[PDB]
Amino acid sequence: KPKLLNKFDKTIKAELDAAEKLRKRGKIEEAVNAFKELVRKYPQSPRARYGKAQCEDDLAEKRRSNEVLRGAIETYQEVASLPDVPADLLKLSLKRRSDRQQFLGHMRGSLLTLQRLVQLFPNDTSLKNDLGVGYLLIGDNDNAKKVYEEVLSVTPNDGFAKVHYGFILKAQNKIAESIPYLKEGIESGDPGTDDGRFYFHLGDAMQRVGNKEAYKWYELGHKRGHFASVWQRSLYNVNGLKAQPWWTPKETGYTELVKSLERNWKLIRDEGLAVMDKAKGLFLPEDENLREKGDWSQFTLWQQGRRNENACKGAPKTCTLLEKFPETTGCRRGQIKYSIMHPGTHVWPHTGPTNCRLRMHLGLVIPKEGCKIRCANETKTWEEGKVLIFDDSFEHEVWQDASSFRLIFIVDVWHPELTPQQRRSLPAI
């Protein structure tokens, strides 16, 4: 179907197919030399150059070398620079270049490629969509929004554009606006629309507006294998881990950590209060759009398993105490942070990104009433000097209706059933 040979390449189709055949047989090593020989002999051959690129691409996979993949990325570029390159080959080569650039984290580099692809194929809708994803991966939602707006103006029915536009809208707290786009988008069934992210955010948006049809979408997302369960909707999971909303200290196995937190809770409290009084700027407002209303701020000591040196100068004793517990300081999918919440606060029902951590809450300053946290179907209260443990990958919700501030200490730990090698290899979150 895809025509990859220009006029001259057709005249050397035999040599080209011979070399390509060696690549398919896994003998990539002598295939490189085959294509390189063709590249020397026919320096203008797009198919020969593409072959060299693909061989380098496979060599990168075998050797796991970033350096040779970097080379392959250049060779893919070289294909597009040659004269008389067939459109199918030009598109294929640059698409792969972008794909591999994102793999290396050259997202800025990938953008230029995707921009070039859109410039070269102005009527290819899928490429505009890919450009939008490129913007999303670098955190550029503004430019991403424009792209999908441009796509939708020409192709209103493109489901891929609708889910992503909807995703961007919800991220902008355009909750009502986002729902029809997410819904119609998933309902399109177009390739790339059956993604857990869109089920997750469609139901959440529906929950915020009081649309009781939200859980029908959660149920469907579960049926399609996006969610472990309707209640537990984290998207970055290790399948099989013990799943329950609430944990006891013994169940976690982290009894020594819990002992230390509860024995020394007052020193943790006092440093938190000292920061509130003398350095409240270290407390940063919650910035994930999780609040319906009210005030909620956090003062983070550890994140992604990395100690914040400057923050710990505000809570030196607490940081020193925690150094002894790598099960939390080494949790690269969790944090260690103070969390202050004031009256008139309601946190929307929400879900953490991963099932790979458990979340400890140590009460520091807890008003006698007004403060509570629901996880799944059970609501509980905090106690000063006492630890609560829950899996925040389950839907949970929070209220603050006291008459003074509520301060807790949050300590994330690896899910205890995670092996040491999993704890070592899992990418940070």
């Binding site: 990168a60 796991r64 070398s65 970033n66 993949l69 793999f103 290396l104 984290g105 994803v133 999303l136 991966l137 955190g139 995703f167 991220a171 992210r197 997750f200 955010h201 984290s234 998207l235 970055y236 919650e286 994930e288 759009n289 999780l290 994140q303 992604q304 944090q335 929400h350 879900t351 953490g352 990104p353 991963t354 925040d392 990418p427 940070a428 979150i429």
Partner: peptide
Amino acid sequence: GKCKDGLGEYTCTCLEGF
């Protein structure tokens, strides 16, 4: 842009190379 308490970001992980 990080996913700390929620799933607000398009991707929560950021990997580079093999």
